[PDB]
Structure formats: C-alpha cells, structure tokens
Amino acid sequence: DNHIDVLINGCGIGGAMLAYLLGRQGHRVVVVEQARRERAINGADLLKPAGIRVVEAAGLLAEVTRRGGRVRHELEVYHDGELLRYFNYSSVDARGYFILMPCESLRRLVLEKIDGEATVEMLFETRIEAVQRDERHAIDQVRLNDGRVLRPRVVVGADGIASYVRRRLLDIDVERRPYPSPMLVGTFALAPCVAERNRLYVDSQGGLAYFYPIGFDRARLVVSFPREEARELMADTRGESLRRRLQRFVGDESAEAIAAVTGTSRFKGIPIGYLNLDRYWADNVAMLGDAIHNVHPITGQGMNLAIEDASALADALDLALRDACALEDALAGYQAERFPVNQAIVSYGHALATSLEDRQRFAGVFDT
Numbered sequence: 614d615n616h617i618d619v620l621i622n623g624c625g626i627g628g629a630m631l632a633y634l635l636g637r638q639g640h641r642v643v644v645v646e647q648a649r650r651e652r653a654i655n656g657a658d659l660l661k662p663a664g665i666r667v668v669e670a671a672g673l674l675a676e677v678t679r680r681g682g683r684v685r686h687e688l689e690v691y692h693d694g695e696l697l698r699y700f701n702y703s704s705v706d707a708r709g710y711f712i713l714m715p716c717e718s719l720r721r722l723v724l725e726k727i728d729g730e731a732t733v734e735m736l737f738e739t740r741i742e743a744v745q746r747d748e749r750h751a752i753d754q755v756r757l758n759d760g761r762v763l764r765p766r767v768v769v770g771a772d773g774i775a776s777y778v779r780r781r782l783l784d785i786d787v788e789r790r791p792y793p794s795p796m797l798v799g800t801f802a803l804a805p806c807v808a809e810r811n812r813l814y815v816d817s818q819g820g821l822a823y824f825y826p827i828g829f830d831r832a833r834l835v836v837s838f839p840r841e842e843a844r845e846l847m848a849d850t851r852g853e854s855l856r857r858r859l860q861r862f863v864g865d866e867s868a869e870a871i872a873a874v875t876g877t878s879r880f881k882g883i884p885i886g887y888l889n890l891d892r893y894w895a896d897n898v899a900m901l902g903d904a905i906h907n908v909h910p911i912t913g914q915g916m917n918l919a920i921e922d923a924s925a926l927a928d929a930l931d932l933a934l935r936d937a938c939a940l941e942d943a944l945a946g947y948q949a950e951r952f953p954v955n956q957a958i959v960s961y962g963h964a965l966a967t968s969l970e971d972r973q974r975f976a977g978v979f980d981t
C-alpha cells in the first residue's frame with residue numbers, strides 16, 4: 614500500500630543505476646533526491662572494464678557511445694617531461710578497454726530509462742525528514758519532507774560523500790584528512806593531440822596535468838599543484854601563469870592542448886577524501902558509492918566504483934527481495950564482494966597521490 618521494496622536516498626549515478634537495475638527486475642522502488650532533476654552535477658568521466666560490464670548488462674552500452682562516450686585503450690604517463698609508462702589495456706585482453714563518458718551524460722541516460730519503469734518512482738526536491746525503527750532495529754517507516762510516509766523493506770544510502778544515511782541513520786562519523794594539493798578540472802576546446810591519446814603529466818615539484826577528450830568536441834584538463842601555488846595559478850584568470858607552469862613539464866606533443874587553456878575561470882575543484890568504511894550496511898540499511906568509500910580522484914574511479922557497487926547491491930537485494938536469502942546474508946555478501954575491490958583502489962589512489970614527485974616510487978606504484 615505504502616509498502617515498498619527499496620527507498621534509495623540520492624539519485625546520483627550510483628543511486629540511479631541501482632534504481633534502474635532494481636526496477637528492471639520489477640521491484641518497487643522510491644528514489645529521493647534533494648536536488649532538481651535538471652541540476653547537472655559534473656563529476657567523474659571514467660568507466661573501467663568492470664563498470665562497463667554493468668552498463669552492458671543494463672542494455673546501455675550502445676547508447677553510451679551514441680551519446681558521446683569514447684572507447685579508449687591507451688594511456689601515456691610522463692614524469693618531468695619524459696615518457697615514464699605507456700599502457701595498452703587491450704594488448705592481452707580485447708575487453709581491456711575503458712570508456713570516457715561524463716557522469717551527467719550517463720546519469721541522464723539512466724534517468725530516461727527509469728522514466729519507463731513503472732515500479733520506480735523518482736522524487737526530486739525531496740528529502741527524508743524522519744524514520745522509525747521496529748523492535749528489531751530495522752527501519753520500518755520513513756517520512757519525507759512532503760509529508761509522504763513509506764514502509765520500505767530496505768533503505769539505501771546512495772547519497773554521496775556527505776551521506777545523510779551514513780551520518781544520520783547509521784550514526785557513523787568519519788574522520789577527514791585533507792591532502793596538501795587540491796585537484797581541479799576545466800573543460801576546453803579539443804586539440805588533435807588529445808583526440809589521439811590520453812596523456813598524464815607529473816613533475817618533481819608536485820605538478821600534475823592530465824589531458825583527455827570528453828564528449829564529442831571538448832577536452833578536459835585535470836591539474837593539481839600544492840595548495841598555495843594552485844591558488845596563485847588560478848588567480849591569474851587570463852591563464853598565462855598556468856600555461857607557463859604547464860610548459861615546464863608538458864612537452865610539445867601537447868602544445869595545442871596547453872594553448873587551448875584560454876583562462877582559469879571555469880576550473881572546478883574536485884573533492885578529495887580517503888575512506889573505506891568497515892561496514893557497508895547495518896540492519897536493513899545498506900550504502901554504495903561515495904557514502905562508503907572515497908578514492909583519490911587521481912584514480913578517476915569515483916563514478917566507476919559507484920556503478921560497480923550498484924550492480925553488486927542490485928544482485929544482493931534482488932536475492933533478498935525474492936526470498937532466496939535472508940537480507941543479512943545478502944548484505945553480508947554485498948560487502949564481501951565489494952570491500953576488497955574498493956579497498957584496493959582507495960589504497961592505490963593514496964599511493965599515487967603521495968608519490969608524484971618521486972619518479973621511481975610513482976612508476977613502482979603503477980606496476981604493483
């Protein structure tokens with residue numbers, strides 16, 4: 614009646630994909646999102662092979678490239694201007710390729726599919742107000758800020774790095790530790806060199822610049838420098854100090870990409886955390902994506918891991934909701950499958966970010 618299978622807090626890329634996968638299975642899903650639907654959150658751009666498998670299982674892979682997603686299989690990494698590593702991800706495995714696809718492009722696609730799933734109801738500009746638990750400490754009722762009351766079998770935090778579900782429903786507090794270098798991303802015209810190949814540049818002074826195409830006709834430039842330097846560089850908004858700083862460690866192959874940086878004003882900061890929560894669930898409440906882990910954005914994997922979590926959670930929840938197994942066993946299974954994968958990328962990110970300056974150490978991180 615007001616009984617539903619799953620109440621998903623947050624309709625980000627993780628939450629959307631979980632809602633679609635559950636809705637495809639005929640589960641009764643309510644998604645609560647505080648923002649308006651059209652609010653575009655720019656975000657990560659990368660899908661790695663495991664994420665691509667989810668997209669492919671959702672029936673979405675063709676539409677990803679039709680909407681500007683790009684299949685790639687190479688990366689060059691430079692340190693102090695010289696090539697350190699070249700990676701061909703498909704040299705052994707034809708499916709080793711990755712995809713560049715803006716988070717918001719993929720989320721809009723998924724939302725279009727949800728629009729046709731009659732068992733899913735998406736509520737925008739809506740928030741959870743209060744919950745009630747039963748004698749077994751499972752949430753049994755949820756009231757929303759519009760006055761709507763629901764009775765869900767399962768509550769999911771897909772609500773991102775400041776997860777309400779984590780903080781308020783599970784009462785978990787997370788220590789922060791900021792990094793000393795921020796990371797910022799800007800969008801520019803696309804140079805032939807960027808269209809050709811992804812190139813990452815780092816230097817012994819702690820500079821980083823990563824150039825890669827996005828969409829049909831744009832390029833990203835992701836940069837990082839120590840905080841005060843980064844501030845000075847972004848202050849000069851016609852961009853001359855940044856172009857010059859890039860020229861110190863970015864060689865001729867990417868000269869046109871550097872010339873494409875006409876200004877600094879549309880650079881955006883990127884969140885940087887370090888987390889992998891030792892529990893992904895309690896009672897009938899589970900979490901995914903940035904609610905449970907924060908990887909250094911140097912890895913590129915924030916969206917990708919949210920999508921991998923979503924798929925594993927949809928599998929585990931489908932089992933529970935079908936009565937193939939007890940919810941606690943299904944949630945325990947979700948955690949065992951995801952935790953080691955998320956942990957490895959969280960460790961890898963931190964190892965990469967802290968080893969920039971040291972050419973040998975940085976190459977060693979790539980290899981291991």
Ligand SMILES: Cc1cc2nc3c(=O)[nH]c(=O)nc-3n(C[C@H](O)[C@H](O)[C@H](O)COP(=O)(O)OP(=O)(O)OC[C@H]3O[C@@H](n4cnc5c(N)ncnc54)[C@H](O)[C@@H]3O)c2cc1C
Pocket residue numbers: 622623624625626627628645646647648654655656657658716739740741771772773774775776777798835881882883884901902903904908909910911912913914915916919
């Ligand atoms: C500009 C930008 C650049 C980025 N670049 C990178 C990068 O280069 N590499 C990288 O690895 N990662 C990057 N990230 C991080 C990456 O986008 C995220 O890791 C990814 O989106 C996580 O997906 P998620 O579904 O878990 O959460 P999110 O995509 O954060 O989605 C959470 C959703 O929950 C909603 N929400 C939050 N609180 C509530 C509430 N109380 N009630 C209801 N709804 C709520 C939010 O509005 C949002 O829609 C970037 C992020 C930003 C914003």
